């Protein structure tokens, strides 16, 4: 259902499958690990990708 989210905090990956981002970036959601962790990549920078905490984003699209 959810396709685009906007990050609301900074986040540094703790593990090598995790996405590092700053606040204000758009993520394209491409998958889910669980209710607290989704998978995606940066809109406009798809090479930046990985697992990220859902609590760190606001739903934007879909």
């Amino acid at each position: 259902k959810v396709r685009r989210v906007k990050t609301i905090y900074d986040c540094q990956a703790d593990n090598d499958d995790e996405l590092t981002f700053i606040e204000g970036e758009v993520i394209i959601v491409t998958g889910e690990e669980d209710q607290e962790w989704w998978i995606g990549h940066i809109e406009g920078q798809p090479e930046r990708k990985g697992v990220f905490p859902v609590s760190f984003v606001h739903i934007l699209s879909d």
């Binding site: 905090y9 986040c11 703790d14 593990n15 669980d34 962790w37 697992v51 609590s55 760190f56």
Partner: peptide
């Protein structure tokens, strides 16, 4: 603002 644990 705590990051939930990976599991």
């Amino acid at each position: 603002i705590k990051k939930p644990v990976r599991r």
